[PDB]
Amino acid sequence: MKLYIYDHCPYCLKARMIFGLKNIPVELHVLLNDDAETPTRMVGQKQVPILQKDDSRYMPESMDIVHYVDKLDGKPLLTGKRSPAIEEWLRKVNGYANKLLLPRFAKSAFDEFSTPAARKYFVDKKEASAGNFADLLAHSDGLIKNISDDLRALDKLIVKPNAVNGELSEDDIQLFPLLRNLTLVAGINWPSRVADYRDNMAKQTQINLLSSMAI
């Protein structure tokens, strides 16, 4: 099995997560962010993650891949309960997280950005207006207080450091990619349980954190 991804994309992280949790090997292939042609040839549009099955066919869409992989060994892991407090917490922070992450993605050493034209494609898609990313970067200190404050509320909701509700659930798939990527944001005050969950779930999922390149 081969998984075509961008390293930064949270939807690709969800698919990566389920392989790591089930200790199922997968060959990661990172696509240049301006590569429309390869994904279009595989599944029609320019979208990732793409999973090449062992029958060599291609499947898109991240939650479809998570469910398909969870069944491969007949022992689905995502059986835990969901939590309304976690979905409201995600609903709020997703409204502004990208103001911290996108301008930092654009600047960071991700394989999908490793040619000038690939990095610039991302910026051309995602930057509202010329130099807006620098204005967002200039306002990082208000944003870093907000995420720090919201992480303190999340600190109260983490039941176990290895599963946010106490048993591995789809909330883990929705929450960890966000916390993975937020470790690219230098300055965050990480509360203790969030930090334990962040580090534990990264060890379980076999996904790296970004602390060494945080900005």
* 26 within some domain: yes
* 1 within some domain: no
Same domain for 141 and 76: no
Q: Phi and psi dihedrals of 86, rounded to 5?
A: -75, -40
Same domain for 198 and 97: yes
Number of domains in the chain: 2
- 134, burial (CB in 10 Å: exposed 0-12, middle 13-18, buried 19+): exposed
Question: Looking at this protein, which amino acid is placed at residue 57?
Answer: R
Same domain for 187 and 173: yes
The parent domain of residue 64 ranges over: 8-85
What is the residue-wise DSSP string for 26-55? -EEEEPPTT--HHHHHHHSSS-S-EEE-TT
What is the residue-wise DSSP string for 68-128? HHHTTTS-----SPP-HHHHHHHHHHTTTHHHHHHHHHTTS--GGG-SHHHHHHHHHHH-S
Same domain for 139 and 66: no
Same domain for 173 and 196: yes
Distance CA 135, CA 110 (A): 22
Tell me how many degrees the CA angle 81-170-6 measures, rounded to the nearest 5.
Answer: 170
Same domain for 209 and 103: yes
Tokens of 135: 């204005």
Same domain for 20 and 51: yes
Q: Which of 28, 52, 85 is the last residue of a domain?
A: 85
Q: Which of 85, 111, 128 is the last residue of a domain?
A: 85
At a CB cut-off of 8 Å and minimum separation 6, what does 124 contact? none
Q: Phi and psi dihedrals of 159, rounded to 5?
A: -70, -50
At a CB cut-off of 8 Å and minimum separation 6, what does 157 contact? 83, 85, 86, 89, 164
* 2 within some domain: no
* 168 within some domain: yes
What is the residue whose two structure tokens read 């069944």?
71
State this model's resolution in angstroms.
Answer: 2.4
Q: What are the percentages of helix, strand and coil residues in the chain, rounded to 5? A: 55, 5, 40
* 3 within some domain: no
Same domain for 122 and 63: no
Same domain for 117 and 51: no
Tokens of 198: 């962040």
The answer to whether 178 and 209 have CB atoms below 8 angstroms apart is no
| Experimental approach | X-ray
Least Cα distance to 12 among 128, 101, 2 occurs for: 2
The answer to whether 37 and 124 have CB atoms below 8 angstroms apart is no
The answer to whether 16 and 5 have CB atoms below 8 angstroms apart is yes
Q: Which of 85, 119, 141 is the last residue of a domain?
A: 85
The answer to whether 49 and 3 have CB atoms below 8 angstroms apart is yes
Same domain for 117 and 71: no
Q: Which residues pair with 58 in a beta bridge?
A: 52
What is the residue whose two structure tokens read 């099995």?
1
Distance CA 57, CA 23 (A): 22
Same domain for 190 and 114: yes
Distance CA 8, CA 113 (A): 10
Same domain for 121 and 78: no
